[PDB]
Short mmCIF file of C-alpha atoms and ligand atoms in Angstrom, two decimals:
data_model
loop_
_atom_site.label_atom_id
_atom_site.label_comp_id
_atom_site.label_asym_id
_atom_site.label_seq_id
_atom_site.Cartn_x
_atom_site.Cartn_y
_atom_site.Cartn_z
CA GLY I 535 108.33 64.79 80.20
CA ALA I 536 110.71 62.11 81.54
CA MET I 537 107.79 60.86 83.64
CA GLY I 538 105.33 60.56 80.74
CA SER I 539 105.67 56.80 80.59
CA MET I 540 105.05 56.18 84.30
CA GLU I 541 101.58 55.55 85.77
CA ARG I 542 100.19 58.42 87.80
CA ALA I 543 99.58 56.02 90.80
CA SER I 544 103.22 54.80 90.50
CA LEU I 545 104.54 58.44 90.54
CA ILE I 546 102.51 59.15 93.70
CA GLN I 547 103.77 55.94 95.36
CA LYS I 548 107.31 56.75 94.41
CA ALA I 549 107.01 60.32 95.71
CA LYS I 550 106.02 58.81 99.04
CA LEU I 551 109.03 56.45 99.00
CA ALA I 552 111.29 59.42 98.02
CA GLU I 553 109.97 61.34 101.02
CA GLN I 554 110.81 58.43 103.36
CA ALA I 555 114.31 58.23 101.80
CA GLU I 556 114.80 62.02 102.11
CA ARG I 557 115.33 62.21 98.30
CA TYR I 558 113.44 65.46 97.79
CA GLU I 559 114.70 66.20 94.24
CA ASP I 560 113.29 62.77 93.23
CA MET I 561 110.13 63.42 95.15
CA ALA I 562 109.68 66.75 93.29
CA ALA I 563 110.32 65.16 89.92
CA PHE I 564 107.77 62.42 90.69
CA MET I 565 105.18 65.01 91.77
CA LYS I 566 105.85 67.16 88.66
CA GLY I 567 105.16 64.05 86.60
CA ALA I 568 101.94 63.43 88.52
CA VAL I 569 100.69 66.96 87.98
CA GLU I 570 101.47 66.72 84.29
CA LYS I 571 99.10 63.81 83.94
CA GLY I 572 96.54 66.57 83.92
CA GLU I 573 94.21 65.34 86.68
CA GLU I 574 93.39 67.45 89.74
CA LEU I 575 95.38 66.51 92.94
CA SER I 576 93.93 65.31 96.10
CA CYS I 577 94.72 66.91 99.47
CA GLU I 578 97.38 64.24 100.22
CA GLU I 579 98.90 64.65 96.73
CA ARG I 580 98.92 68.55 97.11
CA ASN I 581 100.85 68.03 100.35
CA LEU I 582 103.37 65.76 98.58
CA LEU I 583 103.91 68.32 95.86
CA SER I 584 104.41 71.19 98.37
CA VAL I 585 106.70 69.19 100.71
CA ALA I 586 108.90 68.08 97.82
CA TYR I 587 109.42 71.58 96.28
CA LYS I 588 109.63 73.28 99.76
CA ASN I 589 112.60 70.99 100.63
CA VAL I 590 114.32 71.52 97.26
CA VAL I 591 113.98 75.25 97.22
CA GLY I 592 114.70 75.38 100.99
CA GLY I 593 118.10 73.87 100.31
CA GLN I 594 118.72 76.24 97.52
CA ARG I 595 117.74 79.31 99.58
CA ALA I 596 119.99 78.15 102.50
CA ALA I 597 122.94 77.79 100.02
CA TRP I 598 122.19 81.14 98.38
CA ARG I 599 122.22 82.91 101.74
CA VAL I 600 125.62 81.33 102.65
CA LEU I 601 127.04 82.38 99.26
CA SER I 602 125.50 85.85 99.23
CA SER I 603 126.96 86.45 102.72
CA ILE I 604 130.45 85.36 101.57
CA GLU I 605 130.11 87.54 98.46
CA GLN I 606 129.06 90.62 100.44
CA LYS I 607 132.03 90.12 102.79
CA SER I 608 134.47 89.66 99.93
CA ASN I 609 133.34 93.07 98.39
CA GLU I 610 133.99 95.22 101.51
CA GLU I 611 137.04 97.43 102.41
CA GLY I 612 140.09 96.32 104.42
CA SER I 613 140.66 92.67 103.64
CA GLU I 614 140.98 91.28 100.08
CA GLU I 615 139.24 91.03 96.62
CA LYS I 616 139.78 87.48 95.31
CA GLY I 617 138.22 87.00 91.84
CA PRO I 618 134.81 86.28 90.18
CA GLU I 619 134.26 82.81 91.67
CA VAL I 620 131.99 83.64 94.67
CA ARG I 621 129.74 85.78 92.41
CA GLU I 622 129.77 83.01 89.68
CA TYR I 623 128.84 80.30 92.07
CA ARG I 624 126.14 82.46 93.84
CA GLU I 625 124.75 83.09 90.31
CA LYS I 626 124.73 79.44 89.47
CA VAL I 627 122.79 78.52 92.64
CA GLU I 628 120.48 81.60 92.04
CA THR I 629 119.74 80.48 88.48
CA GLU I 630 118.97 76.94 89.65
CA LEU I 631 116.63 78.35 92.36
CA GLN I 632 114.90 80.54 89.79
CA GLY I 633 114.47 77.48 87.61
CA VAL I 634 112.77 75.54 90.39
CA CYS I 635 110.52 78.44 91.10
CA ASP I 636 109.59 78.81 87.46
CA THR I 637 108.87 75.10 87.28
CA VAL I 638 106.52 75.26 90.28
CA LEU I 639 104.82 78.47 89.01
CA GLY I 640 104.50 76.70 85.61
CA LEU I 641 102.59 73.83 87.21
CA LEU I 642 100.29 76.19 89.09
CA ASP I 643 99.61 78.18 85.90
CA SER I 644 99.23 75.15 83.68
CA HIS I 645 96.77 74.20 84.97
CA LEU I 646 96.41 73.52 88.70
CA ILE I 647 94.97 76.89 89.75
CA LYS I 648 92.34 77.19 86.94
CA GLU I 649 91.07 73.66 87.51
CA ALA I 650 90.88 74.17 91.35
CA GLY I 651 87.15 74.70 92.08
CA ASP I 652 87.05 74.28 95.85
CA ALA I 653 88.30 76.68 98.38
CA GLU I 654 90.75 74.29 100.00
CA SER I 655 92.42 73.52 96.67
CA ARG I 656 92.43 77.00 95.16
CA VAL I 657 93.67 78.70 98.37
CA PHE I 658 96.47 76.00 98.66
CA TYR I 659 97.66 76.66 95.08
CA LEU I 660 97.44 80.47 95.32
CA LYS I 661 99.42 80.36 98.55
CA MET I 662 102.07 78.29 96.64
CA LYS I 663 102.09 80.84 93.86
CA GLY I 664 102.70 83.64 96.49
CA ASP I 665 105.44 81.54 98.12
CA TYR I 666 107.37 80.79 94.83
CA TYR I 667 107.16 84.50 93.73
CA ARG I 668 108.38 85.39 97.26
CA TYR I 669 111.45 83.08 96.72
CA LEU I 670 112.07 84.78 93.37
CA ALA I 671 111.72 88.17 95.17
CA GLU I 672 114.33 87.13 97.77
CA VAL I 673 117.05 86.94 95.00
CA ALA I 674 115.70 89.65 92.68
CA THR I 675 117.44 93.02 92.06
CA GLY I 676 117.06 94.25 88.42
CA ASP I 677 114.22 95.71 86.30
CA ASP I 678 111.83 93.19 88.05
CA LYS I 679 112.06 92.95 91.88
CA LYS I 680 108.98 95.19 91.95
CA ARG I 681 106.85 93.25 89.45
CA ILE I 682 107.84 89.95 91.12
CA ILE I 683 106.90 91.37 94.53
CA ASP I 684 103.58 92.44 93.12
CA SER I 685 102.98 88.96 91.68
CA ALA I 686 103.57 87.42 95.17
CA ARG I 687 101.25 90.06 96.72
CA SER I 688 98.43 89.48 94.18
CA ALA I 689 98.51 85.66 94.62
CA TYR I 690 98.57 85.91 98.44
CA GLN I 691 95.76 88.52 98.40
CA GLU I 692 93.43 86.40 96.23
CA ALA I 693 94.12 83.41 98.45
CA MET I 694 93.41 85.62 101.54
CA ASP I 695 90.14 86.96 100.05
CA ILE I 696 88.92 83.37 99.39
CA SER I 697 90.09 82.03 102.71
CA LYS I 698 88.26 84.68 104.68
CA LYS I 699 85.02 83.98 102.74
CA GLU I 700 85.16 80.16 102.65
CA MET I 701 87.19 78.78 105.61
CA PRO I 702 86.92 79.08 109.43
CA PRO I 703 89.71 81.06 111.18
CA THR I 704 91.32 77.87 112.44
CA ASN I 705 91.58 76.15 109.06
CA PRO I 706 95.31 75.13 108.78
CA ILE I 707 95.43 76.32 105.07
CA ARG I 708 94.01 79.74 106.08
CA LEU I 709 96.48 79.84 108.99
CA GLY I 710 99.52 78.87 106.90
CA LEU I 711 98.59 81.31 104.25
CA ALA I 712 98.37 84.11 106.77
CA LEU I 713 101.64 83.11 108.38
CA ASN I 714 103.42 83.28 105.07
CA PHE I 715 101.77 86.41 103.75
CA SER I 716 102.75 88.06 107.10
CA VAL I 717 106.39 86.99 106.47
CA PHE I 718 106.02 88.45 102.85
CA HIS I 719 105.03 91.76 104.42
CA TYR I 720 107.89 91.74 106.99
CA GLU I 721 110.76 90.44 104.85
CA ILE I 722 109.86 91.35 101.24
CA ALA I 723 107.44 94.31 101.16
CA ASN I 724 109.10 96.31 103.97
CA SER I 725 105.72 96.45 105.67
CA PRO I 726 106.52 95.31 109.29
CA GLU I 727 103.32 96.83 110.67
CA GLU I 728 101.21 94.98 108.21
CA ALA I 729 103.13 91.75 109.06
CA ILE I 730 102.58 92.19 112.78
CA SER I 731 98.87 93.23 112.36
CA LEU I 732 98.16 90.18 110.17
CA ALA I 733 99.87 87.76 112.45
CA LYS I 734 98.11 89.16 115.51
CA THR I 735 94.61 89.30 113.97
CA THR I 736 95.07 85.82 112.58
CA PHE I 737 96.21 84.43 115.91
CA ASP I 738 93.39 86.14 117.90
CA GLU I 739 90.62 85.02 115.48
CA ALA I 740 91.88 81.47 115.54
CA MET I 741 92.08 81.40 119.33
CA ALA I 742 88.37 82.38 119.47
CA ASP I 743 87.41 79.49 117.16
CA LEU I 744 89.41 76.66 118.84
CA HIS I 745 86.35 75.75 120.96
CA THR I 746 84.69 74.28 117.77
CA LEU I 747 87.52 71.77 117.21
CA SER I 748 88.18 68.18 117.87
CA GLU I 749 91.37 67.20 119.67
CA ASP I 750 93.09 66.37 116.36
CA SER I 751 92.02 69.52 114.59
CA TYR I 752 93.02 71.49 117.67
CA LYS I 753 96.55 69.98 117.53
CA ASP I 754 96.87 70.94 113.81
CA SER I 755 95.59 74.56 114.28
CA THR I 756 97.54 75.29 117.44
CA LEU I 757 100.83 74.11 115.83
CA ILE I 758 100.53 76.91 113.24
CA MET I 759 99.24 79.39 115.75
CA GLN I 760 102.50 78.83 117.72
CA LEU I 761 104.44 79.77 114.52
CA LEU I 762 102.45 82.99 114.31
CA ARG I 763 103.32 83.67 118.02
CA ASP I 764 107.05 82.73 117.33
CA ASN I 765 107.15 85.33 114.58
CA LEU I 766 105.43 87.99 116.66
CA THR I 767 107.96 87.30 119.45
CA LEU I 768 110.78 87.82 116.90
CA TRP I 769 109.26 91.10 115.65
CA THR I 770 108.06 92.76 118.84
CA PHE E 1486 114.61 84.09 110.16
CA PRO E 1487 110.80 83.81 110.60
CA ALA E 1488 108.70 80.71 110.39
CA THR E 1489 106.80 79.73 107.18
CA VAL E 1490 104.91 76.58 106.20
CA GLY X 1428 134.10 67.34 80.87
CA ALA X 1429 131.62 70.11 81.78
CA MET X 1430 134.47 71.62 83.96
CA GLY X 1431 137.05 71.64 81.24
CA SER X 1432 136.75 75.35 80.65
CA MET X 1433 137.14 76.30 84.32
CA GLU X 1434 140.53 77.06 85.94
CA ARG X 1435 141.80 74.41 88.35
CA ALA X 1436 142.21 77.07 91.11
CA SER X 1437 138.66 78.23 90.50
CA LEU X 1438 137.31 74.64 90.78
CA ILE X 1439 139.11 74.22 94.12
CA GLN X 1440 137.78 77.58 95.33
CA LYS X 1441 134.21 76.62 94.34
CA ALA X 1442 134.48 73.24 95.91
CA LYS X 1443 135.25 75.09 99.20
CA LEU X 1444 132.30 77.39 98.67
CA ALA X 1445 130.06 74.35 97.93
CA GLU X 1446 131.18 72.67 101.10
CA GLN X 1447 130.20 75.82 103.09
CA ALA X 1448 126.85 75.84 101.34
CA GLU X 1449 126.29 72.10 101.98
CA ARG X 1450 126.06 71.64 98.20
CA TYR X 1451 127.98 68.28 98.07
CA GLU X 1452 126.88 67.25 94.59
CA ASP X 1453 128.30 70.52 93.31
CA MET X 1454 131.39 70.05 95.46
CA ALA X 1455 131.96 66.63 93.96
CA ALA X 1456 131.53 67.89 90.43
CA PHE X 1457 134.01 70.69 91.03
CA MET X 1458 136.53 68.28 92.52
CA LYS X 1459 136.09 65.76 89.63
CA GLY X 1460 136.85 68.69 87.35
CA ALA X 1461 139.97 69.51 89.39
CA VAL X 1462 141.22 65.94 89.32
CA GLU X 1463 140.65 65.81 85.53
CA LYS X 1464 143.09 68.71 85.09
CA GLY X 1465 145.64 65.92 85.43
CA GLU X 1466 147.81 67.43 88.19
CA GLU X 1467 148.41 65.64 91.51
CA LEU X 1468 146.22 66.82 94.38
CA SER X 1469 147.56 68.38 97.62
CA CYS X 1470 146.48 67.04 100.97
CA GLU X 1471 143.83 69.80 101.34
CA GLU X 1472 142.53 68.98 97.85
CA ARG X 1473 142.40 65.22 98.57
CA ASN X 1474 140.34 66.00 101.61
CA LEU X 1475 137.95 68.11 99.54
CA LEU X 1476 137.59 65.27 97.03
CA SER X 1477 136.91 62.67 99.76
CA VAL X 1478 134.48 64.87 101.77
CA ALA X 1479 132.50 65.63 98.60
CA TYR X 1480 131.96 62.08 97.43
CA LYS X 1481 131.60 60.72 100.98
CA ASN X 1482 128.63 63.07 101.49
CA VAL X 1483 127.08 62.24 98.06
CA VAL X 1484 127.39 58.48 98.46
CA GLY X 1485 126.45 58.70 102.11
CA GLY X 1486 123.08 60.14 101.11
CA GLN X 1487 122.62 57.48 98.47
CA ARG X 1488 123.50 54.69 100.97
CA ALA X 1489 121.09 56.03 103.53
CA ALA X 1490 118.33 56.20 100.89
CA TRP X 1491 119.11 52.72 99.58
CA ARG X 1492 118.87 51.28 103.12
CA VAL X 1493 115.45 52.88 103.68
CA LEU X 1494 114.28 51.54 100.35
CA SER X 1495 115.72 48.04 100.68
CA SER X 1496 114.11 47.85 104.12
CA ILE X 1497 110.69 48.77 102.67
CA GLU X 1498 111.26 46.35 99.81
CA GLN X 1499 112.13 43.47 102.16
CA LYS X 1500 108.96 44.16 104.26
CA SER X 1501 106.77 44.29 101.19
CA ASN X 1502 108.00 40.85 100.05
CA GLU X 1503 107.14 38.95 103.35
CA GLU X 1504 104.01 36.92 104.26
CA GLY X 1505 100.87 38.10 106.00
CA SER X 1506 100.34 41.63 104.78
CA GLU X 1507 100.23 42.69 101.07
CA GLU X 1508 102.15 42.65 97.76
CA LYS X 1509 101.65 46.14 96.08
CA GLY X 1510 103.52 46.22 92.74
CA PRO X 1511 107.00 46.80 91.16
CA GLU X 1512 107.43 50.39 92.40
CA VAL X 1513 109.55 49.89 95.54
CA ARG X 1514 111.95 47.55 93.66
CA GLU X 1515 112.00 49.95 90.69
CA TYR X 1516 112.89 52.94 92.94
CA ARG X 1517 115.47 50.96 95.01
CA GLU X 1518 117.01 49.98 91.67
CA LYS X 1519 117.11 53.56 90.49
CA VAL X 1520 118.90 54.73 93.60
CA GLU X 1521 121.20 51.67 93.46
CA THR X 1522 122.12 52.50 89.87
CA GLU X 1523 122.89 56.08 90.73
CA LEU X 1524 124.99 54.98 93.71
CA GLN X 1525 126.91 52.56 91.47
CA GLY X 1526 127.47 55.37 89.02
CA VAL X 1527 129.02 57.60 91.69
CA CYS X 1528 131.21 54.69 92.90
CA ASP X 1529 132.33 54.01 89.32
CA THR X 1530 133.10 57.74 88.85
CA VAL X 1531 135.26 57.88 91.94
CA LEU X 1532 137.01 54.53 91.09
CA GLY X 1533 137.60 55.94 87.65
CA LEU X 1534 139.31 59.01 88.99
CA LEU X 1535 141.53 56.84 91.22
CA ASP X 1536 142.39 54.56 88.30
CA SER X 1537 142.92 57.38 85.79
CA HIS X 1538 145.29 58.50 87.18
CA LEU X 1539 145.43 59.47 90.84
CA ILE X 1540 146.83 56.20 92.25
CA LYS X 1541 149.57 55.64 89.71
CA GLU X 1542 150.87 59.22 90.01
CA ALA X 1543 150.81 59.10 93.88
CA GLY X 1544 154.52 58.63 94.84
CA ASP X 1545 154.34 59.41 98.55
CA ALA X 1546 152.98 57.20 101.26
CA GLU X 1547 150.41 59.79 102.43
CA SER X 1548 148.95 60.24 98.99
CA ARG X 1549 149.03 56.61 97.81
CA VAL X 1550 147.54 55.22 101.09
CA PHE X 1551 144.75 57.84 100.96
CA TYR X 1552 143.80 56.91 97.40
CA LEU X 1553 144.01 53.11 98.01
CA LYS X 1554 141.84 53.59 101.12
CA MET X 1555 139.32 55.41 98.88
CA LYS X 1556 139.48 52.64 96.32
CA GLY X 1557 138.68 50.12 99.10
CA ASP X 1558 135.84 52.34 100.37
CA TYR X 1559 134.18 52.75 96.99
CA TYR X 1560 134.40 49.00 96.27
CA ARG X 1561 132.97 48.45 99.73
CA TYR X 1562 129.96 50.66 98.83
CA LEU X 1563 129.50 48.66 95.61
CA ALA X 1564 129.74 45.50 97.71
CA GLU X 1565 126.92 46.66 99.97
CA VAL X 1566 124.44 46.64 97.10
CA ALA X 1567 125.91 43.71 95.13
CA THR X 1568 124.24 40.31 94.69
CA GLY X 1569 124.83 38.73 91.26
CA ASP X 1570 127.79 37.12 89.46
CA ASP X 1571 130.01 39.78 91.14
CA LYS X 1572 129.60 40.36 94.92
CA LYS X 1573 132.64 38.18 95.32
CA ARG X 1574 134.90 39.88 92.79
CA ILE X 1575 133.79 43.28 94.12
CA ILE X 1576 134.59 42.16 97.71
CA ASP X 1577 137.98 41.05 96.63
CA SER X 1578 138.71 44.32 94.84
CA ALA X 1579 137.93 46.20 98.08
CA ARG X 1580 140.09 43.73 100.07
CA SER X 1581 143.03 44.08 97.61
CA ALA X 1582 142.95 47.89 97.72
CA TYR X 1583 142.72 48.07 101.56
CA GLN X 1584 145.47 45.40 101.86
CA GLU X 1585 147.88 47.37 99.67
CA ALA X 1586 147.08 50.49 101.64
CA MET X 1587 147.62 48.64 104.93
CA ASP X 1588 150.97 47.16 103.77
CA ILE X 1589 152.26 50.72 102.85
CA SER X 1590 150.82 52.32 105.93
CA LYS X 1591 152.61 49.84 108.25
CA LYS X 1592 156.00 50.36 106.46
CA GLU X 1593 155.83 54.16 106.02
CA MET X 1594 153.65 55.81 108.68
CA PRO X 1595 153.66 55.88 112.49
CA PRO X 1596 150.78 54.10 114.28
CA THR X 1597 149.14 57.41 115.18
CA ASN X 1598 149.02 58.77 111.58
CA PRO X 1599 145.39 59.81 110.95
CA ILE X 1600 145.43 58.24 107.45
CA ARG X 1601 146.76 54.92 108.87
CA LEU X 1602 144.15 55.07 111.60
CA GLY X 1603 141.28 55.85 109.26
CA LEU X 1604 142.32 53.13 106.88
CA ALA X 1605 142.40 50.60 109.70
CA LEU X 1606 138.98 51.75 110.96
CA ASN X 1607 137.37 51.28 107.59
CA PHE X 1608 139.18 48.00 106.72
CA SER X 1609 137.99 46.68 110.10
CA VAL X 1610 134.37 47.63 109.15
CA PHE X 1611 134.98 45.96 105.74
CA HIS X 1612 135.87 42.79 107.66
CA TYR X 1613 132.80 43.00 110.00
CA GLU X 1614 130.09 44.12 107.61
CA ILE X 1615 131.17 42.85 104.16
CA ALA X 1616 133.64 39.94 104.53
CA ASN X 1617 131.81 38.20 107.38
CA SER X 1618 135.07 38.22 109.26
CA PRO X 1619 134.08 39.74 112.70
CA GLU X 1620 137.14 38.27 114.46
CA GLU X 1621 139.44 39.89 111.94
CA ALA X 1622 137.49 43.17 112.33
CA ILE X 1623 137.80 43.13 116.18
CA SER X 1624 141.52 42.05 116.03
CA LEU X 1625 142.36 44.82 113.63
CA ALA X 1626 140.56 47.53 115.60
CA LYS X 1627 142.11 46.42 118.85
CA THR X 1628 145.69 46.16 117.55
CA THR X 1629 145.39 49.48 115.78
CA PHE X 1630 144.01 51.16 118.89
CA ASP X 1631 146.73 49.66 121.22
CA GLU X 1632 149.63 50.52 118.91
CA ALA X 1633 148.33 54.05 118.50
CA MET X 1634 147.92 54.52 122.29
CA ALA X 1635 151.59 53.54 122.73
CA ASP X 1636 152.68 56.22 120.17
CA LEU X 1637 150.62 59.18 121.52
CA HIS X 1638 153.52 60.28 123.67
CA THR X 1639 155.39 61.44 120.48
CA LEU X 1640 152.64 63.83 119.49
CA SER X 1641 151.92 67.54 119.82
CA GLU X 1642 148.65 68.61 121.35
CA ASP X 1643 147.09 69.19 117.88
CA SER X 1644 148.30 65.84 116.46
CA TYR X 1645 147.07 64.19 119.68
CA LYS X 1646 143.57 65.62 119.12
CA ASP X 1647 143.47 64.31 115.46
CA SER X 1648 144.69 60.85 116.37
CA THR X 1649 142.59 60.39 119.49
CA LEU X 1650 139.46 61.40 117.54
CA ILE X 1651 139.89 58.37 115.26
CA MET X 1652 140.97 56.14 118.15
CA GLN X 1653 137.63 56.90 119.75
CA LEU X 1654 135.90 55.65 116.63
CA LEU X 1655 137.86 52.36 116.86
CA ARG X 1656 136.75 52.15 120.51
CA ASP X 1657 133.12 52.89 119.50
CA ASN X 1658 133.17 50.11 117.02
CA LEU X 1659 134.76 47.68 119.49
CA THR X 1660 132.02 48.59 121.95
CA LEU X 1661 129.37 47.87 119.34
CA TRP X 1662 130.97 44.45 118.50
CA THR X 1663 131.96 43.07 122.01
CA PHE V 1468 125.97 50.85 112.04
CA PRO V 1469 129.74 51.19 112.70
CA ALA V 1470 131.86 54.28 112.29
CA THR V 1471 133.96 55.00 109.15
CA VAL V 1472 135.91 58.07 107.89
C1 LIG U 3198 95.39 69.07 101.52
C2 LIG U 3198 95.59 70.00 102.72
O1 LIG U 3198 94.52 70.37 103.27
N1 LIG U 3198 96.74 70.32 103.14
C3 LIG U 3198 96.93 71.17 104.38
C4 LIG U 3198 97.54 70.38 105.50
C5 LIG U 3198 97.18 71.06 106.81
C6 LIG U 3198 98.03 70.55 107.98
N2 LIG U 3198 99.44 70.77 107.71
C7 LIG U 3198 100.14 71.62 108.51
O2 LIG U 3198 99.67 72.15 109.45
C8 LIG U 3198 101.66 71.79 108.16
N3 LIG U 3198 101.89 72.23 106.77
C9 LIG U 3198 101.09 73.18 106.07
C10 LIG U 3198 101.34 73.37 104.65
C11 LIG U 3198 100.56 74.29 103.91
C12 LIG U 3198 99.57 74.97 104.51
CL1 LIG U 3198 98.72 76.15 103.61
C13 LIG U 3198 99.37 74.81 105.90
C14 LIG U 3198 100.06 73.93 106.61
C15 LIG U 3198 102.49 70.58 108.49
C16 LIG U 3198 103.74 71.03 109.21
C17 LIG U 3198 103.73 72.52 109.19
C18 LIG U 3198 102.21 72.88 109.11
C19 LIG U 3198 99.86 69.95 106.58
C20 LIG U 3198 99.09 70.36 105.30
C1 LIG U 3199 145.70 65.10 103.30
C2 LIG U 3199 145.49 64.30 104.51
O1 LIG U 3199 146.50 63.99 105.13
N1 LIG U 3199 144.29 63.93 104.88
C3 LIG U 3199 144.01 63.25 106.17
C4 LIG U 3199 143.25 64.10 107.20
C5 LIG U 3199 143.59 63.57 108.58
C6 LIG U 3199 142.71 64.22 109.61
N2 LIG U 3199 141.29 64.01 109.29
C7 LIG U 3199 140.50 63.25 110.07
O2 LIG U 3199 140.95 62.73 111.13
C8 LIG U 3199 139.01 62.97 109.68
N3 LIG U 3199 138.93 62.44 108.31
C9 LIG U 3199 139.73 61.38 107.73
C10 LIG U 3199 139.59 61.08 106.39
C11 LIG U 3199 140.36 60.14 105.74
C12 LIG U 3199 141.35 59.49 106.53
CL1 LIG U 3199 142.34 58.28 105.75
C13 LIG U 3199 141.48 59.74 107.83
C14 LIG U 3199 140.73 60.70 108.47
C15 LIG U 3199 138.19 64.23 109.84
C16 LIG U 3199 136.89 63.86 110.51
C17 LIG U 3199 136.90 62.33 110.66
C18 LIG U 3199 138.38 61.99 110.74
C19 LIG U 3199 140.97 64.68 108.04
C20 LIG U 3199 141.78 64.11 106.87
MG1 LIG U 3200 97.36 55.65 83.34
MG1 LIG U 3201 121.09 86.28 88.52
MG1 LIG U 3202 93.54 93.10 105.29
MG1 LIG U 3203 144.93 76.76 83.75
MG1 LIG U 3204 120.80 46.72 90.38
MG1 LIG U 3205 147.32 41.54 109.35
#
């Protein structure tokens, strides 16, 4: 694409600069370019990719929620109906969000996932695939909320199956996957019991494995465990 | 809203 | 442009929605469209225009400062020189910033300023013209930092002359103009004494006029006076 | 950095 003429190493370097500058749209474009070079990504590079798109889509999701809220309020009884603008603008943001999700899913399908041989890489990408189908699910309504939801579920499930076979219970990727799949169950699949069960089992199995960790690994794992606890506190 | 990473 | 087919009232409404959604790039595009309808802007609409572009350019300026800092550090002795990437990316952000400034200056020149008959409108636009030349000045080096600086100065000066003739010393537009022109003197024109003198005289003349104000006007004026005091505290 | 509006 537009990044075809830039060196891979230069794209990675610029993604890092863009992160420092809080220029996440640029960071995402640089990392898209890097992926499209066709080489596998290192752990650091996978993190850059995920941080970039998480920030971009995060902004879009926040905006969509504000707009959807206004739209809902404008459509109720006992105030005023004031034209197509709120719907139009929510739709515009929605379409842009869907576009970013499709871009990320495109990168994962062509060809990050299939080239990911190791557990750490494959679980990371399948978690991402689950996440970006989840974001699509958040805004879906028509002939396709169900198929989108199933696509999220399938990706998360495959990731979970690999993670349980190949990674210890404290592995941050395994923990983050479980955190997000738990949120999928609560917020998307209307499965709050599955959400709570998953968060609790993940937390407890991690607790029991903390003794094997260095101080630094401990810090990383416990950070995500706290997020599991935060969610459980919200839900129970 | 719940935490994700 | 791309907004030519949208109703003026719809553009304004969407700018307001974009503000709520913290989508400042969209907000700026909507307000550009509104200006290009060719009608004068109301006070509320002028505020939307200024808020939008202030946020967009603010982000760019923050990013530019991070990048310039990294670039400066990478060019010094006793560490490492590591390629053209930091300069390239600072340049990219710089060019985008210059583009936004040129867009805003374009709107003011075609034709907001010339159609602005009243003091409140004309001072507001000339202040903006000063501000966007100031942002250009911040990143300027070559055959043109001086002419850019003079363009900022000329716009601010005309605004100041009108403001002193036509507005009371507590008028928020007059106050904000003086605040920014004072910063121009300190940060751009290497005139710290002029900066301090202007901030102090503006503050003192406003203080003496507060007695004429309602509680609400008082709140508005004193907010900006506090900014003058904050700057004076920084500089003295 | 100084305040502007
Ligand atoms: C390459 C790699 O192994 N990346 C995972 C690494 C683990 C540590 N870490 C974190 O704990 C945070 N982010 C993520 C992101 C994705 C997953 Cl699957 C897990 C954790 C950093 C702040 C929140 C948690 C960074 C990424
Ligand atoms: C149409 C109009 O009169 N706009 C001015 C209005 C005055 C009150 N106000 C403020 O005090 C803040 N912003 C600005 C922006 C530009 C100027 Cl010239 C002065 C003040 C709001 C937060 C910071 C001060 C909003 C704009
Ligand atoms: Mg090469
Ligand atoms: Mg839609
Ligand atoms: Mg299970
Ligand atoms: Mg019309
Ligand atoms: Mg340049
Ligand atoms: Mg003077």
